[PDB]
Ligand binder design. Structure first.
Ligand SMILES: [Zn+2]
Length: 99
């Protein structure tokens, strides 16, 4: 037995990092994490505050602060994300989940 994780991105259009970066044109001044790191780690900006979603697993995160690693938060909250696993690797995700 065992269902399989689907391969289709939640938002295929936001699969381009370049386009993900564009969405952070209004990423707030009181925000504390750089758009480039966020966009690199699969996230694009939604709304007018500091909410982001991953283009693939659609994991939603907000309340970002100075020192938050987008790749680490990605692995903390959405470990089965296929974009995350292909980018950072099995060992990286396992490491964040254990600790
Ligand atoms: Zn994801």
């Amino acid at each position: 037995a065992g269902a399989t994780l689907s391969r289709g991105p939640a938002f295929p259009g936001m699969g381009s990092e370049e386009l993900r970066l564009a969405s952070f044109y209004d990423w707030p001044l009181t925000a504390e994490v750089p758009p480039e790191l966020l966009a690199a780690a699969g996230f694009f900006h939604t709304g007018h505050q500091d909410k982001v979603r991953c283009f693939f697993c659609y994991g939603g995160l907000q309340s970002w602060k100075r020192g938050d690693d987008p790749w680490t938060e990605h692995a903390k909250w959405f470990p089965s994300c296929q974009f995350l696993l292909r980018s950072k690797g099995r060992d990286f995700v396992h490491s964040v989940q254990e600790t």
